[PDB]
């Protein structure tokens, strides 16, 4: 017999009838070309360019189905095959990378997930949480609601996840950023990247966004490096100069942080761009225990763990190894097949980091 | 009965107009309409043909301008011309004789105006050097054929046939009215004059001329003496020596021998 | 440049194109003059 | 009707092109959106003046 070549179908019962063949021989299928420069003479004969990409780009009208209340600069329009008029304005894209830089939802992320830095998180709530929940305070008093704080604490260590507690009880979309996402082999659309970013963020219900290595992206102009790897000179002044502060902001707030903060702009540093700096450093006493308070939810252990000893068998150490030595114990009960993890497997799970890593 | 295979006919008059008017809008799908009569059941003919200016929205039922049309017919009945419109024609630059979907709706307009209206699609820019394209259509298994007339013709062409009979349209065969008074009226245009037919052309062109194909023919001559030296019974190959001897010896006297006799001729009829 | 119908050539045209060219040689430098010059003398006579 | 017929056959939907020169044996050069090159002998609705090539 013939074999099938993975063309696909549905069975007869699924398809057709007359609404099929009437669909196809009455409607006109729309092709795809972006919009321009309506021409406006006087708003009511309007015209629009378009573009057929590799095709052509003609000047074109609307079909009086759609209004220009509907059409703007590109917009994605669909016309017909012979006289191109206006059809349909199409929905956006995906391809601008936002998507990739989207958590889009109230992150997974609460005010007690931080480790210890509570205070932190708290003194940042001021600026940004205070300042859109609690407004009676601030304008009365003389200066509009503030929106922007920076973060700089230990490698790497839990900074970001502030952010997403924040953005949870805020209720706010979250965006997350790092410089690659501003870069491509393509230069110039670095900078716009930025600027669509903020654009399709105000196009959100109002928005959160936050940056890390803010250093390597609000750090000043070098001039003696004299080219290299050089596109940060042409992209990085278009946050520090086109982002906004307190007074200048829209609807929408926005959050930095880096773990190096002796080399950013004081553009950056200044207002128009922050409200408020916090520092942190590597968990205290207090916070590494805090941290695997935390973590006791993040495995199924014998919770009749010493966590109070296990914080200070750490000696000065970050948070995020804390998470790993947690999963660590689990790879204690992986190698060993155990259903459940146990404090010895805690305790030899710290000393892998606390031994191996600085024996 | 029914109508079938049938049979139209266009007057020469007519057909002038139909190429006139296409040559003239290159760019577009010029239309216009045909004056003439449903003569009986089994043919039709056309006499006298009107082109009428463009529309903005080309080929349409609204490109015809009542006003336009109604003092154009009133006019032309005036002058000798009562027939009706039985059919509208438009041409179709870069392809064949077949209807798009504005013609077939704008040809169903007219078989719903009286009774069995024909397009006739015109391409003007490959009907050329002596080559013609046109055809008549009309829409609705046609009505039983009675005779081998439709058998004759080619059937639908790959590029009508796509937009062919499942549009549930068909061809009909064209057929033009000619007349002797015609015949030798268009001939005329051609027809050489005396003081035409007995010029000299040019003695040291005719020496151009003769050149021209001497040389060639002393490389033909090298090249007979190839042909005939391959006598080995090889595969078919008429080329080379073998034809191209026989045709430039055919224009070579004859070039010679007329030019000689014209002016032999001459020579005896001027003193 | 040639017919669009039947492509044979409807005119020559003057040799080669381009909008830069034009606007490198459609723009004005004002009213100057030799005398308006500073006085280089030599150096202008040599240019001339 | 001069200028009813110029409206009623400015089409609606057009092309879109750069300018190139002008000649007088007034008749203009044009560069398609589509790359393509045409030689109008007559530039059209618009005067000279208005055009830069
Ligand atoms: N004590 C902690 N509590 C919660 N998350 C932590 C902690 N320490 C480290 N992290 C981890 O840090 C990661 C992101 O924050 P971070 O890398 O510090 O941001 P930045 O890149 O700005 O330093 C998160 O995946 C989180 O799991
Ligand atoms: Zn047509």
Not at chain 4, 14 to 41: G, H, M, W
């Amino acid at each position: 017999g013939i074999k099938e070549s993975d063309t696909g179908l549905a069975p007869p019962a699924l398809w057709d009838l007359a609404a099929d063949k009437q669909t196809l021989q009455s409607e006109q299928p729309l092709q795809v070309a972006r919009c321009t420069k309506i021409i406006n003479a006087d708003s009511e004969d309007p015209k629009y360019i378009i573009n057929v990409k590799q095709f052509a780009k003609f000047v074109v009208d609307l079909s009086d189905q759609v209004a220009p209340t509907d059409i703007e600069e590109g917009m994605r329009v669909g016309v017909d095959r012979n006289k191109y008029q206006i059809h349909i304005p199409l929905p956006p894209i995906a391809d601008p990378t936002v998507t990739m830089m989207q958590v889009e939802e109230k992150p997974d992320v609460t005010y007690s997930d931080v480790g210890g830095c509570k205070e932190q998180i708290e003194k940042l709530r001021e600026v940004v949480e205070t300042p859109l929940l609690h407004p009676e305070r601030f304008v009365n008093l003389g200066i509009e609601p503030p929106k922007g704080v920076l973060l700089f604490g230990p490698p790497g260590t839990g900074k970001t996840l502030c952010a997403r507690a924040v953005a949870n009880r805020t209720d706010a979309c979250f965006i997350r950023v790092i410089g690659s996402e501003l870069v491509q082999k393509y230069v110039g659309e670095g900078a716009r990247m930025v600027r669509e970013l903020f654009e399709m963020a105000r196009t959100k219900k109002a928005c959160l966004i936050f940056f890390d290595e803010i250093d390597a992206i609000g750090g000043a102009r070098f001039d003696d490096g004299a080219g290299g790897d050089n596109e940060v000179q042409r992209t990085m002044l278009e946050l520090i100069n086109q982002l906004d502060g307190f007074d200048p902001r829209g609807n929408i707030k926005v959050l930095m942080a880096t773990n190096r903060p002796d080399t950013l702009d004081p553009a950056l540093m200044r207002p128009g761009r922050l409200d408020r700096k916090i520092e942190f450093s590597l968990p205290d006493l207090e916070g590494r225990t805090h941290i695997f308070k935390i973590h006791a939810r993040s495995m199924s252990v014998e919770r009749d763990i010493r966590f109070e000893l296990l914080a200070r068998l750490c000696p000065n150490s970050t948070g995020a190894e804390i998470r790993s030595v947690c999963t660590e114990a689990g790879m204690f009960a992986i190698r060993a097949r155990r259903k459940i993890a146990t404090e010895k497997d805690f305790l030899e799970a710290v000393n892998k980091v606390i031994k191996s890593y600085a024996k | 009965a029914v109508d079938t295979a049938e049979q139209v006919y266009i007057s020469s008059l007519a057909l002038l107009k139909m190429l006139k008017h296409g040559r003239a809008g290159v760019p577009m799908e010029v239309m216009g309409l045909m004056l003439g009569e449903f003569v009986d059941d089994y043919t039709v003919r056309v006499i006298d043909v009107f082109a009428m200016p463009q529309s903005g929205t080309g080929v349409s039922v609204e490109a015809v301008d009542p006003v336009f049309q109604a003092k154009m017919l009133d006019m032309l009945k005036q002058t000798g011309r009562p027939e009706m419109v039985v059919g509208w024609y438009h041409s179709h630059p870069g392809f064949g004789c077949w209807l798009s979907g504005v013609d077939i709706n704008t040809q169903q307009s007219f078989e719903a105006l009286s009774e069995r209206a024909v397009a006739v699609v015109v391409d003007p820019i490959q009907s050329v050097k002596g080559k013609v394209v046109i055809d008549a259509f009309r829409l609705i298994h046609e009505p039983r054929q009675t005779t081998s007339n439709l058998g004759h013709l080619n059937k639908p062409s790959i590029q009508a046939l796509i937009h062919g009979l499942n549009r549930h349209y068909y061809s009909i065969t064209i057929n033009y009215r000619k007349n002797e008074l015609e015949q030798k009226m268009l001939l005329n245009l051609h027809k050489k004059s005396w003081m035409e037919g007995l010029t000299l052309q040019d003695y040291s062109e005719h020496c151009k001329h003769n050149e021209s194909v001497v040389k060639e023919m002393l490389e033909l001559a090298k090249n007979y003496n190839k042909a005939v030296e391959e006598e080995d019974k090889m595969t078919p190959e008429k080329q080379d020596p073998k034809r191209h001897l026989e045709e430039h010896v055919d224009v070579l006297m004859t070039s010679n021998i007329v030019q000689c006799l014209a002016a032999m001729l001459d020579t005896v009829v001027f003193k | 440049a040639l017919d669009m119908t039947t492509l044979t050539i409807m005119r020559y045209l003057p040799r080669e194109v381009d909008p830069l060219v034009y606007n490198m040689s459609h723009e004005d430098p004002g009213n100057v003059s030799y005398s308006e010059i500073g006085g280089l003398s030599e150096q202008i006579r040599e240019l001339r | 009707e001069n200028s009813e017929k110029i409206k009623v056959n400015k089409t609606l939907p057009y092309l879109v092109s750069n300018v190139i020169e002008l000649l007088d044996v007034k008749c203009a050069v044009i560069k398609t959106s589509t790359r393509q090159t045409y030689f109008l002998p007559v530039i059209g609705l618009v005067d000279a003046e208005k055009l830069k090539p």
